Amino acid sequence: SMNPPPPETSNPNKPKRQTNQLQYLLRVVLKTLWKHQFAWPFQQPVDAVKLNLPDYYKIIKTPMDMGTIKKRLENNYYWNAQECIQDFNTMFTNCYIYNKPGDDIVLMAEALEKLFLQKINELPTE
Ligand SMILES: Cc1cc(/N=N/c2ccc(S(=O)(=O)Nc3ccccn3)cc2)c(N)c(C)c1O
Numbered sequence: 001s002m003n004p005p006p007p008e009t010s011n012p013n014k015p016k017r018q019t020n021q022l023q024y025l026l027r028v029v030l031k032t033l034w035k036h037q038f039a040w041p042f043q044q045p046v047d048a049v050k051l052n053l054p055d056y057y058k059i060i061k062t063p064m065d066m067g068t069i070k071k072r073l074e075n076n077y078y079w080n081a082q083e084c085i086q087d088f089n090t091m092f093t094n095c096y097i098y099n100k101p102g103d104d105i106v107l108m109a110e111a112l113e114k115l116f117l118q119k120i121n122e123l124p125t126e
Helices: 020-034 066-074 081-098 104-121
Strands: none
Touching (some): 020 066, 020 081, 081 104
16 A cells, blocks of 8 residues: 555645744744654654555544644644644544554653643643
8 A cells, every 4th residue: 555645734725824822832842842752753644655554544544743733833734723733632642543552652652742731731822
């Protein structure tokens, strides 16, 4: 099986804006997670071909990753902070669906998610 195309990251038919929350999500949240020691599985779409995961895209229909999120932020793809937050949550959830408790990748997701949630608790005002 081929990989699916990656998620879209730019669309000139959507309106654009910068908000203080979206700024925080790129400059604080995304950049803090990106440099973490456990970021590496999450920095690009899951390459099911290269990683020998032939059922990955049979199970995961809404793939998401932080490379995609970073590009979406940088391209003003998101209008609402919640859309971005949702993408992070999808990314974690997919990892929990496909993998099992105690897998190394799950433990890495958990740690990154706890950090994510801490930072989201510190989002500034609308
Ligand atoms: C999200 C997710 C990601 C997964 N793998 N992601 C990977 C992402 C990148 C690599 S890498 O370029 O070899 N870089 C490495 C490999 C090992 C250690 C540090 N960096 C390997 C795997 C994976 N195998 C599953 C099952 C997942 O659910």
